[PDB]
């Protein structure tokens, strides 16, 4: 029910199985075509030059806002941390939980 205030992207929710590796993001739908991803630290807390990714698409709209969601899950069995990129009209924008990204407990 409740939004982001002013991010372009910013993290709805997210899990981990030991397993699995899931979650949700909100999207600020400034242009059609996009590209958002996960991007998560080594179970050793290793990014691999941000080469640990892991692609989010469209679930559905919000109503009511210029937001929307998507959805990610996807096998990892090594995960420490993350963070969410997103690319739209040629421009970059994150969600680095500012600056201390996301720790996964596990
Ligand atoms: O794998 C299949 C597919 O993958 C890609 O498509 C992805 C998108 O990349 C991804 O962003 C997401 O789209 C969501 C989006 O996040 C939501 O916001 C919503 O989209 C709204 C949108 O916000 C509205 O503004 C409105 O869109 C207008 C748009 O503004 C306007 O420019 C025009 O769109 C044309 C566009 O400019 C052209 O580039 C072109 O694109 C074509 C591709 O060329 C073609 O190959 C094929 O993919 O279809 C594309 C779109 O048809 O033509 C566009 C029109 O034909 O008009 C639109 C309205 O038609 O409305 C939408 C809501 O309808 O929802 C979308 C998803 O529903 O998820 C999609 C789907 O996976 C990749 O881009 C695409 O090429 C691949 O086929």
């Known amino acids: 029910a409740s939004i982001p205030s002013s991010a372009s992207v910013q993290l709805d929710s997210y899990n981990y199985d030991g397993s699995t590796f899931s ?16 991007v998560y630290a080594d179970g050793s807390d290793n990014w691999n030059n941000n080469g640990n990714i892991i692609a989010a698409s469209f679930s559905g ?29 040629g421009k970059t924008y994150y969600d680095n939980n500012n600056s201390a990204n996301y720790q996964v407990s596990t």
Not at 77 to 85: A, L, M, S, V
């Open 23 to 38: 979650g949700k993001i909100y999207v600020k739908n400034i242009a059609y075509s996009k590209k958002v991803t996960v």
């Open 61 to 89: 709209p919000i109503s009511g806002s210029n937001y929307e969601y998507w959805t990610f899950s996807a096998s990892v069995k090594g995960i420490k941390e993350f963070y969410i990129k997103y690319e739209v009209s």
